Motif scaffolding. Structure first.
Motif, PDB file in Angstrom:
ATOM      1  N   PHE A 216      45.155 -24.614 -32.787  1.00 34.11           N
ATOM      2  CA  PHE A 216      45.686 -25.644 -33.669  1.00 34.11           C
ATOM      3  C   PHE A 216      46.943 -26.254 -33.050  1.00 34.11           C
ATOM      4  O   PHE A 216      47.884 -25.538 -32.716  1.00 34.11           O
ATOM      5  CB  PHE A 216      45.957 -25.062 -35.060  1.00 34.11           C
ATOM      6  CG  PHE A 216      44.761 -24.377 -35.671  1.00 34.11           C
ATOM      7  CD1 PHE A 216      43.790 -25.113 -36.337  1.00 34.11           C
ATOM      8  CD2 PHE A 216      44.585 -23.004 -35.552  1.00 34.11           C
ATOM      9  CE1 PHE A 216      42.676 -24.488 -36.881  1.00 34.11           C
ATOM     10  CE2 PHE A 216      43.471 -22.383 -36.098  1.00 34.11           C
ATOM     11  CZ  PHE A 216      42.514 -23.126 -36.752  1.00 34.11           C
ATOM     12  N   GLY A 217      46.940 -27.586 -32.898  1.00 31.36           N
ATOM     13  CA  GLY A 217      48.067 -28.335 -32.357  1.00 31.36           C
ATOM     14  C   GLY A 217      49.029 -28.750 -33.467  1.00 31.36           C
ATOM     15  O   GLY A 217      49.040 -28.138 -34.535  1.00 31.36           O
ATOM     16  N   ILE A 218      49.830 -29.794 -33.212  1.00 30.35           N
ATOM     17  CA  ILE A 218      50.763 -30.282 -34.216  1.00 30.35           C
ATOM     18  C   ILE A 218      49.969 -30.642 -35.474  1.00 30.35           C
ATOM     19  O   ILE A 218      48.936 -31.305 -35.391  1.00 30.35           O
ATOM     20  CB  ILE A 218      51.623 -31.447 -33.667  1.00 30.35           C
ATOM     21  CG1 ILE A 218      52.716 -31.886 -34.649  1.00 30.35           C
ATOM     22  CG2 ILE A 218      50.760 -32.621 -33.224  1.00 30.35           C
ATOM     23  CD1 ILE A 218      53.806 -30.866 -34.866  1.00 30.35           C
ATOM     24  N   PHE A 219      50.440 -30.163 -36.628  1.00 36.68           N
ATOM     25  CA  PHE A 219      49.766 -30.357 -37.903  1.00 36.68           C
ATOM     26  C   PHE A 219      49.454 -31.838 -38.138  1.00 36.68           C
ATOM     27  O   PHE A 219      50.194 -32.714 -37.695  1.00 36.68           O
ATOM     28  CB  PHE A 219      50.640 -29.800 -39.030  1.00 36.68           C
ATOM     29  CG  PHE A 219      51.968 -30.498 -39.177  1.00 36.68           C
ATOM     30  CD1 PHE A 219      52.079 -31.661 -39.929  1.00 36.68           C
ATOM     31  CD2 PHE A 219      53.107 -30.001 -38.557  1.00 36.68           C
ATOM     32  CE1 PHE A 219      53.298 -32.311 -40.064  1.00 36.68           C
ATOM     33  CE2 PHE A 219      54.327 -30.652 -38.690  1.00 36.68           C
ATOM     34  CZ  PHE A 219      54.419 -31.806 -39.442  1.00 36.68           C
TER      35      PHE A 219
ATOM     36  N   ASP B 149      42.624 -28.819 -36.669  1.00 33.69           N
ATOM     37  CA  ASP B 149      41.476 -28.083 -36.155  1.00 33.69           C
ATOM     38  C   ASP B 149      40.742 -28.959 -35.139  1.00 33.69           C
ATOM     39  O   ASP B 149      39.614 -29.391 -35.385  1.00 33.69           O
ATOM     40  CB  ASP B 149      40.584 -27.585 -37.304  1.00 33.69           C
ATOM     41  CG  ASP B 149      39.542 -26.543 -36.921  1.00 33.69           C
ATOM     42  OD1 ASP B 149      39.646 -25.978 -35.814  1.00 33.69           O
ATOM     43  OD2 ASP B 149      38.630 -26.299 -37.741  1.00 33.69           O
TER      44      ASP B 149
ATOM     45  N   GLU C 279      51.375 -30.767 -44.816  1.00 31.78           N
ATOM     46  CA  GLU C 279      50.849 -30.380 -43.514  1.00 31.78           C
ATOM     47  C   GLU C 279      49.428 -29.839 -43.667  1.00 31.78           C
ATOM     48  O   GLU C 279      49.165 -29.035 -44.557  1.00 31.78           O
ATOM     49  CB  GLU C 279      51.751 -29.339 -42.846  1.00 31.78           C
ATOM     50  CG  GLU C 279      53.184 -29.800 -42.632  1.00 31.78           C
ATOM     51  CD  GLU C 279      54.138 -29.550 -43.787  1.00 31.78           C
ATOM     52  OE1 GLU C 279      53.874 -28.641 -44.588  1.00 31.78           O
ATOM     53  OE2 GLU C 279      55.145 -30.268 -43.879  1.00 31.78           O
ATOM     54  N   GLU C 280      48.520 -30.296 -42.793  1.00 30.63           N
ATOM     55  CA  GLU C 280      47.165 -29.780 -42.671  1.00 30.63           C
ATOM     56  C   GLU C 280      46.954 -29.271 -41.247  1.00 30.63           C
ATOM     57  O   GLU C 280      47.434 -29.875 -40.291  1.00 30.63           O
ATOM     58  CB  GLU C 280      46.139 -30.893 -42.905  1.00 30.63           C
ATOM     59  CG  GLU C 280      45.728 -31.078 -44.354  1.00 30.63           C
ATOM     60  CD  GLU C 280      44.552 -32.023 -44.548  1.00 30.63           C
ATOM     61  OE1 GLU C 280      44.159 -32.698 -43.565  1.00 30.63           O
ATOM     62  OE2 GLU C 280      44.027 -32.077 -45.678  1.00 30.63           O
ATOM     63  N   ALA C 281      46.201 -28.173 -41.125  1.00 32.48           N
ATOM     64  CA  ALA C 281      45.850 -27.579 -39.844  1.00 32.48           C
ATOM     65  C   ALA C 281      45.097 -28.598 -38.994  1.00 32.48           C
ATOM     66  O   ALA C 281      44.135 -29.205 -39.458  1.00 32.48           O
ATOM     67  CB  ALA C 281      45.014 -26.340 -40.073  1.00 32.48           C
TER      68      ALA C 281
ATOM     69  N   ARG D  61      47.137 -19.101 -31.109  1.00 31.13           N
ATOM     70  CA  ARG D  61      46.532 -19.683 -32.297  1.00 31.13           C
ATOM     71  C   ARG D  61      47.125 -21.052 -32.635  1.00 31.13           C
ATOM     72  O   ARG D  61      46.374 -21.981 -32.928  1.00 31.13           O
ATOM     73  CB  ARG D  61      46.620 -18.742 -33.505  1.00 31.13           C
ATOM     74  CG  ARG D  61      45.823 -19.218 -34.713  1.00 31.13           C
ATOM     75  CD  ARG D  61      44.356 -18.857 -34.606  1.00 31.13           C
ATOM     76  NE  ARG D  61      44.224 -17.406 -34.620  1.00 31.13           N
ATOM     77  CZ  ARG D  61      43.212 -16.716 -34.102  1.00 31.13           C
ATOM     78  NH1 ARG D  61      42.209 -17.342 -33.511  1.00 31.13           N
ATOM     79  NH2 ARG D  61      43.211 -15.396 -34.175  1.00 31.13           N
ATOM     80  N   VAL D  62      48.463 -21.173 -32.634  1.00 29.94           N
ATOM     81  CA  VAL D  62      49.106 -22.343 -33.227  1.00 29.94           C
ATOM     82  C   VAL D  62      50.386 -22.723 -32.475  1.00 29.94           C
ATOM     83  O   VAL D  62      51.183 -21.861 -32.103  1.00 29.94           O
ATOM     84  CB  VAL D  62      49.345 -22.150 -34.744  1.00 29.94           C
ATOM     85  CG1 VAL D  62      50.274 -20.985 -35.054  1.00 29.94           C
ATOM     86  CG2 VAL D  62      49.817 -23.427 -35.426  1.00 29.94           C
ATOM     87  N   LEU D  63      50.572 -24.036 -32.272  1.00 25.79           N
ATOM     88  CA  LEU D  63      51.783 -24.598 -31.688  1.00 25.79           C
ATOM     89  C   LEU D  63      52.892 -24.584 -32.741  1.00 25.79           C
ATOM     90  O   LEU D  63      52.680 -25.034 -33.864  1.00 25.79           O
ATOM     91  CB  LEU D  63      51.483 -26.027 -31.205  1.00 25.79           C
ATOM     92  CG  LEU D  63      52.682 -26.955 -30.971  1.00 25.79           C
ATOM     93  CD1 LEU D  63      53.403 -26.642 -29.663  1.00 25.79           C
ATOM     94  CD2 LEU D  63      52.246 -28.411 -30.985  1.00 25.79           C
TER      95      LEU D  63
END
Ligand code: O9T
Ligand code: O9T
Lengths: 809, 809
Positions: free
Chosen positions: A152-155, A170, A166-168, A260-262
């Motif tokens: 997952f990048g910037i929301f 994907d 904010e949304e994931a 997983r996430v930035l």
């Protein structure tokens, strides 16, 4: 249709269509009857990717043959955006693909829009990495981008009731056709454990293993047949991991969370363990890979074959890690390992703002990376010994320069580590580089003046002109040819066209077409009605106090109040567009978004205003939205408090695309004004020197509130609830900050800003003189090409010569 | 080389090589210099997959045109094994691919070995699903396998110090080239929430949403150009899920855990929430998909267009779910919805063992699926009303037949739900089906005798002969042609060859070649030395008390003790091979593995024994190991206590591959002996009737220990630590169970087993008579083809006619 988009040969087009239909069938397992637009995008993506493969294989082969010095760009962020159009641009396939798809009864533009942004970045720092990769490929450098493949990048940013949600992101849901997994190049990364001191040196043992699996993405150079690699690491648990049974399998997620996430913070340090894990993960996996490539060409020659560029302090652990490998594993002596490290590593600083500075608690490094801490302490001791010898008795210097900060909790200053362990430290604009030498790294400069360089930022003219603004590219090409795309300095030739009626007409026409197209885009995707004849006043960037969206808000409310006072007086119509994401935990940034939308609710629905003033918040500002709005812009807002914005790059994007700049003498603004001439720039506000003067005596905002009636009215409106009728006290935090705790001196610049904005409007009333000034900007924007930037990195830091020579197809 | 592997035409071979080199380049981004064997496997996989695509698209198209009745096989397990060779077999590409790869300087056999098993199953139940899919494609049925795409299948089994250790089966690490993601067919599945009763019926609200993303895998029929679909669902979190920020993103894992791992229990119920989620997930996503396909052809016609087969009770929620959709969403009346449901659904029972019976606590269903519970209660009320009317005053019947079991905690009997909500209930062998009617479902049979059928299990002769045993396939083909592969009854023609010297020579030669190849495979991969001239005595299946590996262990120790007593007396040499996985929490099964290896440690290292007796534990028994060891087997061990093994399918695999069977009159063994003749089968031990007699009076194991000196010696050896010198009491749990708590009466069958084993050895001394008996087995194995099984399902349950007619290529 247009020339800079390449040839559409009967052969090429026939071939593309055949391969499109092949991929649809074999790759996507679809026929024309069941295919969705997404299938069509994928078919085209695969078809275009097919043209990369040969060049990609040849390029890597070539680098094996010739064994050039290799550049490793370490960043935790690569803000790539979309790949398809860029690939087509650099391969000269755009028109051919347009024609091929057209004949299949498809609109390529519609297919392009289906592609997700690779939003693996926050803002400036991330986008700089992306531009750099493009330039390094274009300049024929054996260069590799190394980072993390975040799931997952910037929301994705939604506005709900005027608030950011904010949304994931994907982005990998539907698959990524650009990447190639390389499981055979999987490498172990170690965490935790403890240090054991044997007869034969220190040994790191009882560690937890995470595997790093690389994914390769091609980076095509502009029409040179070079394709470099971006390698991004994914976290994978080992098979013996946690190995009741079911829970063990489920707990593999723990380990895989690393990629997983930035972290969505722009110029802000959050001291979280998961973040440190990401930093070590990318560094450990990369250095192993670097060393492996090197050994397939003793360590004397490492710096002649390897350069490692650290994008900010995020991969600072590369310095201790390289030492650890060299000392603990390769069994070099400390001093020799250190020489190799220093001669290999170089550090780019991106900001002076203290809240951005990475200062890792010792207790965290103690637990997670016990050996790296010992090595850091050893670096610190030896560094401080050199200081002591150079500045005998200057005990305070010792304290100030220490890698280890004493205090409540001990911390490691990663910036100090970077300066100590690098042969080159650079800022990202002249004024910023000077500030580093004068202020925050004064002591370091005094010790090692030779280390400190400037490398003013730039943007790739491929994405940021040819790709996003083909109409401007073309009219420029009609006059001066195509050479400029890989040699942007050639734009100076446009100065001789500043009095050409035809060119003035063309520049203005392209701008109008861009505006019409953007105003249309708004209606289609976010049902809102804007006047295309108005001045497009745009500020797009991350939401920050230092970037002073609030100053813009004050101007907007000023225009509004002026209209209301004198309804029947002429004003130049404006569409004010502000866009940007706030970090999810940045309360003030989230309040600013709300204020922006709250102003819009008032202004946009006032009958007296008409279409003279519109305030639009641009939702989900990202790379692909920058490509749309920037070409459509008239006025670029670059209004950070002097000394805060290290460089900026948005500023350069707008200059290249025929918008005028209103801005402070901050960052690269200073060099832009220098290049174009101050008379061709809407410069206002305090200089750096002025801010210092104010700080010495103290900033009292009350003074401005007392002396400026227009300003007082606005603050009374905010407080009393003019813009929040239902929640009158909504904006108390905004008012309170502006009045009592404003680090960025919004009121100090208010008067000069409004006046300077009046001058913008005055020039806009005269289309011909506006356009002539625009031409003077575009024509002097050459310096701000990342080609120039990378050329300077290559010559002055990396020690490699750039090349414009083509590889054979 | 051999005929049944198809033609290797100059055109085909040229074409395959061209496409191999294409995929290597474009798909894998490799040249010949850098490619690993894994790359080569992938290139071939993609090349072979290319031949499926056309047929796959045409088949699904055809099913749209003709709109036949659709079969939906719901299973939580599909034990597929490897796909490559099977695909080649069914497409007639094997020899062509062998030739193509050979010319590229590669061994196809070596490439085949690189493919991971799709081990999405435990054992019999899972493998039956796989065989069924193959047969349904071969018989031209519009059939769909529906299940879960587990990230991790059945654990990989390592032996460490004689103990089973479990490793995560990370089968998707390197990618799966056989699947195609269909994100456009993603569907929501709901959990938790509460029921709201409105004016317009019940409403399920405040639910948590998980998305189900389908992956399609092609199921090729045998040479008929039919390609059916296996659709497996993956769990994906929604983008608004949990949406401080970082944790929210990380917590998406919670939701995605649903499709993470296959529960590794064979014939055992574990009442865990995650398991129920898997069961609802597959059912909810599938039924939505079924209904969507149906609506693109009121609900009167649903059962004329839809059959749903429930593989055990694992997808029993299909019954309440179908009602819920029909009643709550489509607004049909209860009675009509029920008629549709019953006429649509059919239930296959796989065991009578009580610990396997799914009995879900009410409190779990209450929380997770509140609406489904209400519907179950409503089904129960209405069902029990019919019982009351048929059997007035039989209150005990009401209690026994209730879907709801009263007790400490209330539970739902999912088997009762299945019988009530299905038009057909079948067992999996004649004796098993009879047992269902006599014992566990006696009451249900008495109410609805029409529902209860038999459908004796089978195995696909494609995988289980042509694929794994090409040499046997060929020598059979030389005599009787190739037709038998899709019509296994034709094997009877081999009876006329039972006195043919040439055929006897050939059968025995193929067996010897298989043994040599397997003995070699052992040395290469697990460095162990076995005599290929010995009798290969193999028991491969999940480790269970009921399957009585322990009985085998007793025989093994008996032979050992007999050799030691009389060292210089001749005995037929044996290699005893036992393989199988224990469920990770099944203590007794894990102890049995340890005993097996502990016997090996003693026997295999005794100088007096020589190579007369060897005991090998086959590590990591899975589909691809079955394909190796089964062709190499002489004696098949099927020695479950009568009444425990519902059918078995291993039994049939060995019969098809030229091993003789020693076994009890249990499961399909009874029908195998019937087909081949009792004189051609090593039948021993209690019948079902005998076990009942023993139960009525009581099973006293002491009696056998007292009367059988050979048995006493063995128990004394186990107890005293003959087989565990360092830990003398290691096997106390084994001894204690055998003596006091043996549900499976190991001692009762001991004497008849050993004697019958003596008869096996006696026949082995006469190769010609052994081989003649083998021929009588192979020649009568036709009934045990899954083609027969599926034909019977189709005619007697689903109401569709099978077809052997080819689709156009
Ligand atoms: C000058 C200047 C720069 C950055 C920031 C900033 C950025 C953030 O992302 C942030 C955050 O996520 C949480 C928080 O509590 C404070 C924060 O502050 C403030 C001021
Ligand atoms: C007859 C018969 C069948 C199955 C079983 C059996 C199978 C299992 O997988 C199992 C388990 O995982 C944990 C456990 O505590 C007991 C278990 O028992 C026992 C006896």
């Amino acid at each position: 249709q247009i020339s800079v988009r390449g040839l559409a040969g009967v052969e090429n087009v026939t071939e593309l269509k055949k391969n499109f239909n092949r991929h649809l069938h074999f790759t996507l397992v679809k026929d024309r009857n069941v295919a969705t637009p997404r299938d069509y995008y994928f078919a085209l993506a695969h078809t275009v990717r097919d043209h990369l493969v040969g060049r990609w294989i040849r390029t890597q082969q070539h680098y094996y043959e010739k064994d050039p010095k290799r550049i490793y760009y370490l960043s935790l962020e690569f803000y790539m955006g979309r790949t398809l159009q860029n690939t087509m641009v650099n391969l000269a396939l755009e028109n051919a693909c347009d024609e091929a798809t057209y004949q299949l009864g498809l609109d390529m533009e519609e297919l392009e829009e289906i592609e997700e942004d690779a939003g693996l970045g926050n803002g400036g720092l991330g986008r700089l990495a992306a531009c750099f990769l493009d330039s390094m490929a274009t300049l024929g450098l054996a260069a590799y981008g190394y980072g993390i493949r975040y799931e997952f990048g910037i929301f994705n940013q939604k506005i709900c009731g005027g608030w950011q949600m904010e949304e994931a992101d994907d982005w990998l849901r539907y698959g990524n056709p650009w990447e190639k997994a390389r499981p055979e190049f999987t490498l172990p990364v170690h965490f935790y454990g403890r240090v054991e001191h044997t007869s034969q040196g220190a040994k790191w043992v009882d560690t937890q293993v995470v595997l790093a699996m690389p994914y390769d993405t091609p980076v095509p150079g502009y029409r040179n047949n070079v394709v470099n690699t971006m390698r991004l690491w994914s976290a994978k648990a080992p098979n013996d991991f946690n190995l009741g049974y079911i829970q063990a399998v489920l707990d593999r997620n723990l380990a895989e969370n690393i990629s997983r996430v930035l972290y969505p913070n722009d110029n802000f340090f959050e001291g979280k363990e998961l973040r440190l894990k990401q930093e070590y993960f990318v560094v450990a996996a990369t250095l192993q890979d670097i060393i492996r490539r090197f050994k397939s060409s003793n360590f004397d020659a490492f710096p002649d074959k390897v350069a490692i560029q650290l994008n900010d302090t995020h991969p600072s652990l590369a310095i201790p890690e390289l030492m650890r490998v060299l000392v603990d594993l390769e069994r070099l002596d400390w001093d020799k390992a250190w020489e190799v490290t220093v001669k290999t590593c170089a550090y780019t600083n991106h900001t002076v703002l203290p809240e951005a500075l990475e200062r890792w608690p010792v207790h965290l490094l103690e637990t997670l990376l016990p050996r790296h801490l010992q090595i850091i302490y050893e670096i610190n001791q030896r560094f401080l010994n050199r200081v002591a010898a150079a500045f005998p008795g200057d005990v305070d210097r010792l304290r100030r320069m220490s890698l280890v900060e004493e205090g409540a909790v001990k911390r490691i200053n990663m910036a100090h580590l970077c300066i100590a362990g690098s042969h080159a430290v650079n800022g990202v604009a002249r004024i910023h580089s000077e500030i580093l030498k004068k202020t925050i790294f004064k002591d370091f400069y005094e010790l090692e003046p030779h280390k400190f360089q400037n490398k003013t930022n730039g943007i790739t003219p491929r994405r940021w002109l040819v790709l996003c603004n083909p109409g401007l590219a073309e009219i420029i090409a009609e006059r001066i040819g195509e050479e400029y795309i890989s040699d942007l300095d050639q734009l100076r030739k446009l100065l001789s066209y500043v009095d050409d009626e035809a060119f003035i007409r063309d520049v203005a026409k392209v701008k109008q077409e861009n505006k019409l197209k953007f105003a249309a885009y708004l209606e289609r995707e976010y049902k809102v009605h804007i006047n295309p004849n108005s001045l497009f006043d745009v500020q797009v960037k991350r939401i920050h106090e230092y970037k002073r969206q609030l100053l813009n808000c004050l101007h907007v409310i000023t225009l509004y109040n002026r209209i209301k006072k004198e309804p029947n007086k002429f004003v130049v119509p404006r569409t004010v567009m502000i866009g940007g994401k706030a970090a999810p935990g940045y309360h003030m940034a989230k309040m600013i978004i709300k204020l922006i939308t709250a102003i819009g609710d008032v202004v946009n629905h006032d009958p007296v205003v008409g279409d003279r003033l519109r305030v639009i918040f641009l939702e989900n500002y990202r790379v692909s939205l920058a490509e749309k709005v920037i070409p459509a812009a008239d006025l670029s807002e670059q209004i950070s408090t002097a000394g805060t914005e290290a460089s900026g790059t948005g500023n350069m994007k707008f200059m290249l695309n025929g918008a005028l700049t209103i801005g402070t003498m901050d960052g690269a603004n200073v060099e832009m004004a220098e290049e174009a001439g101050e008379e061709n720039f809407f410069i206002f506000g305090m200089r750096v020197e002025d801010v210092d003067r104010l700080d010495q005596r103290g900033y009292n905002a009350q003074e401005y509130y007392d002396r400026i009636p227009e300003l007082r009215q606005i603050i009374e409106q905010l407080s009393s609830g003019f813009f929040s009728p239902k929640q009158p006290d909504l904006f108390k935090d905004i008012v309170n900050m502006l009045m009592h705790h404003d680090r960025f001196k919004v009121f100090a610049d208010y008067e000069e800003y409004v006046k300077c904005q009046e001058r913008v409007s005055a020039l806009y009333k005269n289309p011909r003189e506006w356009t002539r000034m625009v031409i003077r900007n575009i024509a002097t924007s050459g310096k701000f090409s990342s080609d120039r930037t990378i050329a300077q990195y290559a010559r002055e830091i990396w020690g490699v010569e750039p090349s414009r020579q083509r590889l054979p197809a």
